[PDB]
Amino acid sequence: LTYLGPDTEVLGDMRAKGQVRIDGLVRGSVLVEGELEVGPTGRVEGERVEARSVLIHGEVKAELTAEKVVLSKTARFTGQLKAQALEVEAGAVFVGQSVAG
Amino acid sequence: LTYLGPDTEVLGDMRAKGQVRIDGLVRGSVLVEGELEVGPTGRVEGERVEARSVLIHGEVKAELTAEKVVLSKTARFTGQLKAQALEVEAGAVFVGQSVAG
Amino acid sequence: LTYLGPDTEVLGDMRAKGQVRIDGLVRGSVLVEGELEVGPTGRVEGERVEARSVLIHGEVKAELTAEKVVLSKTARFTGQLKAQALEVEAGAVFVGQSVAG
Amino acid sequence: LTYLGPDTEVLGDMRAKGQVRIDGLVRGSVLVEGELEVGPTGRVEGERVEARSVLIHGEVKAELTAEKVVLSKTARFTGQLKAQALEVEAGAVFVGQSVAG
Amino acid sequence: LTYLGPDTEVLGDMRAKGQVRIDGLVRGSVLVEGELEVGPTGRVEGERVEARSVLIHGEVKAELTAEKVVLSKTARFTGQLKAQALEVEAGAVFVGQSVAG
Amino acid sequence: LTYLGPDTEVLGDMRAKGQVRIDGLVRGSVLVEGELEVGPTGRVEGERVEARSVLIHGEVKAELTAEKVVLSKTARFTGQLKAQALEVEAGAVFVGQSVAG
Amino acid sequence: LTYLGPDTEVLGDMRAKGQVRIDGLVRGSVLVEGELEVGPTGRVEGERVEARSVLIHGEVKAELTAEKVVLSKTARFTGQLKAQALEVEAGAVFVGQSVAG
Amino acid sequence: LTYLGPDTEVLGDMRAKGQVRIDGLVRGSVLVEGELEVGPTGRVEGERVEARSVLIHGEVKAELTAEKVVLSKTARFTGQLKAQALEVEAGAVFVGQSVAG
Amino acid sequence: LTYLGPDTEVLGDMRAKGQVRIDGLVRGSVLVEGELEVGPTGRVEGERVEARSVLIHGEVKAELTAEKVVLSKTARFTGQLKAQALEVEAGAVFVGQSVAG
Amino acid sequence: LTYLGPDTEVLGDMRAKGQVRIDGLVRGSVLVEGELEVGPTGRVEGERVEARSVLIHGEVKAELTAEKVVLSKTARFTGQLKAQALEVEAGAVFVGQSVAG
Amino acid sequence: LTYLGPDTEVLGDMRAKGQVRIDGLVRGSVLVEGELEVGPTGRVEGERVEARSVLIHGEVKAELTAEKVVLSKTARFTGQLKAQALEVEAGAVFVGQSVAG
Known part of the structure; x- marks a missing residue:
């Protein structure tokens, strides 16, 4: 597990393994x-x-x-995407060219 | 209601009103x-x-x-998209740049 | 079955199979x-x-x-015709050269 | 809390708040x-x-x-230091100029 | 044993053997x-x-x-250091570049 | 008390207070x-x-x-002396000009 | 034995043998x-x-x-001395350079 | 009393008081x-x-x-004399001018 | 024997032999x-x-x-003397240089 | 009494008192x-x-x-004489002028 | 015998022989x-x-x-004499120079 807090602004290229939950920021x-x-x-x-x-x-x-790119009701995507199962629920402002299937 | 059959290949620019179910083809x-x-x-x-x-x-x-662009498990999209609620379930090969939200 | 609605204006060459009911328009x-x-x-x-x-x-x-070209009381034909049983009831303005029998 | 895993190599300048436990790497x-x-x-x-x-x-x-820079038995410091209570237990290879007290 | 008193100011290069307790001064x-x-x-x-x-x-x-450089709560170090087990408890104003480990 | 050991060679000008026992050396x-x-x-x-x-x-x-300069059987003095009660027991090689009384 | 009295002032170089007790004076x-x-x-x-x-x-x-130059509590020496066992008790005003041991 | 021994050669002007017995020599x-x-x-x-x-x-x-100049059997006088009772026993070689009586 | 009386003043050089007792005078x-x-x-x-x-x-x-010049308690000598045993008892006013022994 | 011995040659003027017996010589x-x-x-x-x-x-x-000049048998007088009773016995060679009676 | 009487005054030179007794006088x-x-x-x-x-x-x-000139107690001699045995008893006034012996 790698939990980041609500206010954990990590500049730079984070490289992790295992289950990750990001709640802060990543630059x-x-x-x-x-x-x-x-x-x-x-x-x-x-x-x-x-x-x-x-x-x-x-x-x-x-x-x-x-x-598997699964989303939620309050998600907000931007940019390209490349998945195999693009599962959006309802309320994503999904802006960007994607490939799936 | 405007039901088209399983094998109803309509060439040309179909312009309809009301509930439509297409099961055939549209060129x-x-x-x-x-x-x-x-x-x-x-x-x-x-x-x-x-x-x-x-x-x-x-x-x-x-x-x-x-x-509202709601899909199914066996759907197959191609091309651009412009919705407000892109609700994909799991198995769409959704290929193309979209705007939503 | 292929029902079209009252206001379903289909431009182009519709190609269907089975029972069809057109109530809209075909261009x-x-x-x-x-x-x-x-x-x-x-x-x-x-x-x-x-x-x-x-x-x-x-x-x-x-x-x-x-x-079998069977008509009704409020029908209105125009153009050529080529049938085997031209069954008009009474009130068709049937305008055009036909072959039957 | 901000736990990083055993193998979570984060390049770049991590900026966090709250309790942090790093077990991976920080570059x-x-x-x-x-x-x-x-x-x-x-x-x-x-x-x-x-x-x-x-x-x-x-x-x-x-x-x-x-x-408060408190250490353990298997710690290994390098570089400068500036604390107020440099509490080393026994086995730190503490290499570098420090200020404390 | 070589006990020095509370007020035993020894100028010069003291060279001792065995257990020493200095409580006075050494210049x-x-x-x-x-x-x-x-x-x-x-x-x-x-x-x-x-x-x-x-x-x-x-x-x-x-x-x-x-x-083994073991200290106390009221100690006060200054200058360089070269040990193998730098054991500070809490309250040393340890000022100076050290090597250990 | 300020006891020096048998082999405690102190170079320099020792300045002490209280009871002193020197058994080592003083240069x-x-x-x-x-x-x-x-x-x-x-x-x-x-x-x-x-x-x-x-x-x-x-x-x-x-x-x-x-x-009071009191001596023992195995003492060995050298140099000047200035006392008030020069109490030698027997076997001092007391070599040097003295004032007493 | 050669006892001199309390008031026996002998000028000149007395040369004696045996046990001598002088109580008077010798010039x-x-x-x-x-x-x-x-x-x-x-x-x-x-x-x-x-x-x-x-x-x-x-x-x-x-x-x-x-x-053997043995003294008493009320003795009073002056001048040089050359002995092998300078045994002073306490109260001699022993004034002068000596060799012993 | 002032006894001199058998071999107590005193150079110089002896000045005594009390009973004296000389058995040594006086120069x-x-x-x-x-x-x-x-x-x-x-x-x-x-x-x-x-x-x-x-x-x-x-x-x-x-x-x-x-x-009173009293002598013995083995005495030997020389030089002047001035007494009040010149009591010689027998065998003095009394050589020198005397006054007595 | 040659006894002279108490008042027998003999002028001149008396020459006698044997035992003599003079009680008078001799000039x-x-x-x-x-x-x-x-x-x-x-x-x-x-x-x-x-x-x-x-x-x-x-x-x-x-x-x-x-x-042998033996004297008495009331004797009175004057002048030189030359004896071998000058035996004076106590009270002679013996005035004059003598040789004896 | 004043006895002179057989050989008592007295030179000089003998002056005596009392009974005298001369047996020696008088010059x-x-x-x-x-x-x-x-x-x-x-x-x-x-x-x-x-x-x-x-x-x-x-x-x-x-x-x-x-x-009274009394003599004996072996007497021998010479010189003058002045007596009151010149009693000669027999054999005196009485040579010299005398007065008597 | 030649006796002269008491009063027989013979002038002249009497010359006798033998025993003579003169009692008178001789001139x-x-x-x-x-x-x-x-x-x-x-x-x-x-x-x-x-x-x-x-x-x-x-x-x-x-x-x-x-x-032999023998005398008596009442004799009276005068003048010179020349005898060999001058036997006077006591009382002669013997006046004159004599030779005897």
Whole structure:
């Protein structure tokens, strides 16, 4: 597990393994092997968010790439995407060219 | 209601009103005011699919635009998109740049 | 079955199979295998209306061709015709050269 | 709380708040307000490790600055230091000029 | 044993063997083989304090060198240091570049 | 009390207070207020040995000055002397000009 | 035996043998082989007082030389001395450079 | 009493008081107040032998002067004499001008 | 025997032999071989009184010469003397230079 | 009594008192008050033999003067005489002028 | 025998022989060979009375000469005499120079 707090602004290229929950901020690119969660006030601003299963509940602005990109009602995506199962519930402002299926 | 059959290949620019269920084929652009459904073997190949609520269960290849673009497990999107609530369940090969939220 | 609504203006060459009921409009040529009905406010404006049994209750303007061309009291034909049993009831303004029998 | 895992190599300048436990790696400078812990396999390689209470149990190589710099038996410090209560237990290879008291 | 009193100001380079307890003052360099203790009002002002185990409870200002440099709550170090187990309890104003481990 | 060990060679001008027992060596001048004893293997080599009561049992070579200079059977004095009660027992090689009485 | 009285002032160089007790005065140099005693009111003023064992209880002012120079509480020496066992009890005003041991 | 031994050669002017017995030698002048005795091996060689009662039993060579000059069988006088009762027993070699009576 | 009376004043040089007792007076020199006695009131005034044994009990004034000159308590000698045993008892006013022994 | 011996040669003027017996010799003048006797070997050679009673038994050669000049058988007178009773016995060689009666 | 009476005054030179007794007087010189006696009242006044033995009992005044001149108590001689045995008893006034012996 790698929990970040509500106010944990990490500049630079975070490289993690295992289950991650981000609730703070990331300025840079996140490279996770395992489950990822962006929290409700979390923000992952950068270029590369690569994971295995992403649960977006806050904001993301990067060229995200995963297997299962599952979202929530208050999510906010931006940028490119490359998944295999783009599961949006209802209320994502999903702005950007994606590939799936 | 405007039901099209399983094998009803309509060339040209279909312009409908009310609830529509397409299960056949459309070669051209669909302009519907009301609920729209593409059936499981349906295909809407063209450029403009504009509606109010779209339920995709087959294939679409056009610059779709709606309010609520809700999909199914066996859907297959292609092309641009412009919605307000992009609700994908799991298994859409959603290929193309979208705007939502 | 392929029901079109009262206001379903389909531009282009509709190609259907099975029982069809048109009540809207067609701009183009209708190619149906099976029973066809033009509704009371329906209009099939074009060139080719080919079917197996046609029930005209609105307006047609094309080179219709069928087996049994049965009409109604408020029908309005225009153009050529080629049937095998031209069954008009009373009030068709049947304008155009026909072959039957 | 902000727990990092055993293998969470964060490049860049981590800026956190609250209780932090680092067990992975940091390439860069750590700026924490609150309790800090470097885990046994943790390493904080960089220039600036500023906190309020630091518990070193692995390796640090930076110009650390805190109030209470408490260590463990297997700790390994390097670089400058500026504390108010430098509490080393026994086995730190504490290499570098310090100010305390 | 070599006990010095509370007010025993020894100018010059004291060279001792065995257990030493200094409680007075030393102006000069102390060369002890064995346990050393600086008392609470003791002061070892000079350049070279070399021993085997040092217990600082007062003030030292020299380039101390030992195996085990254990301190107390009211100690006050100054100058360089070269130990193998720098065991500070809490309240030393330890000012100076050290090597340990 | 200020006991020096059997092998405690103190270079420089020792300045003490209270009861002193020297058994090691002194290279320099001893300034004691109080009882002084040179031990059997002790040696106080220098210039100024000033005290209040001196008990010589080893060797002294300085311009000693006291009130009561009491010696032993194995003592060995050298140098000037200035006392008030020069109490030698038998076997001192007392070499040097003295004033007493 | 050679007893001199309390008031026996002998000018000149007395040369004696055996046990001598002087209680009077000598103006000159005393050369005795054997035990010598200066009495309490005796005075041996001169240059050479050479003997084998001297017991001073009064005053002497000469370059005394003996084997055992034993004194008393009320003795008063002056001048040089050359003995082998300078045994002073407490209260001699022993003024002058001596060799012993 | 002032006894001189058999071999007590006193150079110089002996000045005594009380009873004197000389048995050694005198080189010089004897001034005695009281009884005087020259012993059998005694010799008083000089110039002035003044006393109160003289008992000569050895040799005298001086200008003797007394009150009662009593001698013995083995006496030997030389020099002047001035007495009041010159009591010679038999065998004195009394050589020198005398006054008596 | 040659007894002279108490008042037998013999002028001139008496020359006698044997035992002589003079009790009177002699003006001149007495030459006796044998014992001589001057009585208590006798007087031998002259120059030469030579005898063998002289017993003086009165007065003599001459250069007496004998072997044994024995005197008494009331004798009175004057002048030179030359004897071998000058035996005076106590009370002779023996005035004059003598040789004896 | 004044006895002179057989060989008592008295030179000079003998002056005696009392009974006298001369048996020796007289060279000179005899002045006796009292009985006089010249012995058998006596000789009174001189000038003045004055007495009170003279008993001549030897030789006389002088101007004798007495009261009773009694002689003996072996007497020998010479010189003047002046007596009052010249009693010669038989055998005197009485040579010299006399007065008597 | 030749007796002269008491009053027989013979002038002239009597020349006799034998025994003579004169009791008278003779004026002149008597020449007798033999014994002569002058009686008590006899007187022989003259110059020469020569005899052999003279017994004078009175007075004679002459130069008498005999062998034995024996006298008496009342005799009275005068003048010279020349005898060989002048035997006077006591009371002769014998006046004159004599030779005898």
